[PDB]
Write a protein that binds this ligand. Structure first.
Ligand SMILES: O[C@@H]1[C@@H](O)[C@H](O)OC[C@H]1O
Ligand SMILES: [Ca+2]
Ligand SMILES: [Ca+2]
Ligand SMILES: [Ca+2]
Length: 513
């Protein structure tokens, strides 16, 4: 009754609402809202289960009671049976435990409301609200409202680094349900990458895709994109091309995983389409979202020095294991330029285009990456080099501060910018200490800051860590690679980094130059 958590009006963006059912379509329309404002029209259904949903893990806790409330409206003959269902997954139970929580017969032509009070089991999470009728009728909703009963530049990274670059992190579909993580990002980061949720296999749609219309979807990414847009955090798209996390069928003549490899001519179609539509859908669904960067091609250069010498950097043709289905089809890395051309053609001008890579400071590879990228920069096609920076706490050796600076500098010497895209600093299972860790973090931020304070053509425009805390890292906890412990308290790396910039220099992290 007292306090509000979700107010979805639909004025600008789809507010994290997605088609329930693979062929159900969603579209926001001007003046079909409640009170002639903007509204969310659900078309092409197929069953009473088909509909629309929104995962609201960010705002709805287990074991709290919520006022759920939606204005709906239809346009058929006679009356309609509208349902409001809350589902979840339970951290124990571990199956999608559903529940219909309000029924309401609703007549043609009229902005009727629907509601109910509901409490989820003490434990539940990854909630989710969804709207259906007992028929297969088009409908419209607006004003989704959920409620429960009951410049000062700050000591935060984004403010601290406001005059330098964006300081980012990573959300995923697990973390997007964590109270204190939400609090953390809001407090500290002004950039977010989707860990998995905007990769090809999370966004392509098999069913009725075609060589010149590749069906795509932001459903997986939606809660993330919505939370960032609503809170003015920018976003790096990640990633359009990658030998990995991309389903095989995308490469096959009959959109089967076990098909036949398609012509080049055919992949040019499928590639262009995926990119075009992928930009279309963002623009369409989340236009207020600041899409400031995108990883156009990801990790396309071999780690094998034999391949960087003779084969331009081409990975081995094939699928899985670190083989490239792209190289499989195209015979080599010609496809990189192609992809950056489509990207350039459809990306918003404010969204800068990056080649993203790891082991980016290992000489034979570094040289390869940098050659490629300079060539693209000079052609108007690339804007920046993405240094993934999966390094360790060692001040020396392979990913050591010298080899690191060397690459950084060599990249910047291209003209283009550089971003530090997926930074983590591995204690190699306790081999190094949280201090030698701190020292390395402090060193990296420091090297970025130097570049920025020098020339000038190129700049480091963002520095983002691959995860929010040590409890959510693809490297495993045992390597405590991040700035925050499993309880979100700052680690020694956090202040090492929290003190490179003097208070007289902080800024609006919500408005960073
Ligand atoms: O997508 C990320 C990729 O860019 C990096 O190479 O490896 C970790 C992945 O999550
Ligand atoms: Ca809105
Ligand atoms: Ca509205
Ligand atoms: Ca598959």
């Amino acid at each position: 009754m007292d306090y509000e958590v979700v107010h979805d009006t639909f004025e600008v963006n789809f507010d994290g609402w997605c088609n329930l059912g693979v062929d159900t379509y969603l579209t926001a329309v001007e003046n079909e809202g409640n009170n002639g404002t903007r509204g969310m029209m659900v078309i092409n259904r197929s069953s009473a289960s088909d509909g629309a949903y929104s995962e609201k893990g960010f705002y709805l806790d287990g074991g709290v009671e919520y006022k759920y409330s939606v204005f709906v409206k239809h346009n058929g003959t006679g009356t309609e049976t509208f349902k409001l269902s809350v589902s979840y997954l339970d951290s124990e139970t571990e199956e999608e435990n559903k529940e219909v929580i309000a029924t309401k017969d609703v007549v043609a032509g009229e902005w009727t409301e629907i509601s109910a009070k509901y409490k989820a089991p003490k434990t539940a999470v990854n909630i989710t609200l969804s709207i259906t009728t007992d028929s297969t009728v088009d409908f419209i909703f607006d004003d989704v409202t959920i409620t429960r009963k009951g410049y000062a530049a700050n000591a935060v990274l984004k403010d601290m680094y406001a005059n330098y670059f964006r300081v980012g992190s990573v959300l995923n579909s697990g973390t997007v349900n964590n109270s204190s993580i939400k609090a953390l990002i809001l407090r500290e980061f002004n950039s977010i990458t989707c860990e998995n949720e905007m990769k090809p296999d999370a966004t392509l749609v098999q069913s009725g895709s075609t060589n010149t219309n590749i069906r795509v979807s932001l459903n997986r990414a939606a809660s993330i994109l919505n939370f960032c847009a609503q809170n003015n955090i920018a976003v790096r798209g990640h990633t359009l091309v990658w030998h990995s996390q991309t389903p095989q069928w995308f490469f096959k003549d009959n959109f089967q995983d076990n098909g036949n490899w398609v012509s080049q001519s055919v992949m040019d179609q499928r590639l262009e389409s995926y990119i075009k539509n992928m930009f279309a859908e963002i623009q369409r669904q989340y236009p207020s979202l600041n899409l400031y960067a995108y990883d156009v091609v990801n990790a396309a250069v071999s780690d094998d020095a034999n391949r960087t010498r003779y084969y331009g950097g081409a990975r081995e043709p094939g699928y899985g294991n670190g083989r490239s289905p792209w190289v499989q089809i195209y015979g080599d890395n010609k496809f990189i330029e192609k992809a950056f051309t489509y990207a350039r053609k459809y990306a918003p001008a404010n969204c800068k285009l990056y080649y993203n890579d790891y082991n980016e400071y290992w000489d034979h590879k570094r040289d390869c990456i940098a050659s490629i990228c300079a060539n693209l920069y000079n052609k108007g096609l690339l804007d920046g080099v993405g240094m993934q920076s999966h390094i360790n706490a060692d001040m020396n050796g392979f990913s050591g501060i010298q080899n690191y600076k060397a690459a950084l500098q060599k990249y910047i010497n291209i003209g283009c910018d550089v971003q530090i895209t997926e930074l983590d600093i591995s204690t190699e299972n306790g081999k190094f200490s949280l201090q030698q860790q701190a020292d390395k973090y402090k060193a990296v931020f420091q090297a970025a800051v130097d570049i920025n304070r020098t020339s000038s053509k190129g700049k480091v425009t963002a520095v983002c860590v691959w995860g929010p805390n040590d409890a959510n890292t693809w490297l495993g906890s045992q390597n405590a690679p991040l700035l925050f412990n499993a309880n979100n308290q700052p680690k020694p790396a956090y202040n090492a980094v929290a003190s490179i910039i003097p208070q007289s220099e902080w800024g609006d992290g919500n408005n960073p130059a």
